[PDB]
């Protein structure tokens, strides 16, 4: 429930009060966050 869901907590909440079709602006901003979070696995045990 830390960052794994905290970034998803700020993602769905940002996609809640979307007036127009601004959900793509949230997607490009959140997919850029989760893709930069895929670089976190550069460390960690390889198994």
From Swiss-Prot:
The organism's place on the tree of life at top rank: Bacteria
Record's subcellular location: Cytoplasm
Source organism of this protein record: Escherichia coli (strain K12)
Membership in a protein family: Belongs to the class-II aminoacyl-tRNA synthetase family. Phe-tRNA synthetase alpha subunit type 1 subfamily.
Gene field: pheS
Descriptive protein name: Phenylalanine--tRNA ligase alpha subunit
Subunit structure comment from the entry: Tetramer of two alpha and two beta subunits.
């Amino acid at each position: 429930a830390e960052l794994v869901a905290s970034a998803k907590a700020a993602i769905s909440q940002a996609s809640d009060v979307a007036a127009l079709d601004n959900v793509r602006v949230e997607y490009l901003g959140k997919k850029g966050h989760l893709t930069l979070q895929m670089t976190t696995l550069r460390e960690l045990p390889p198994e």
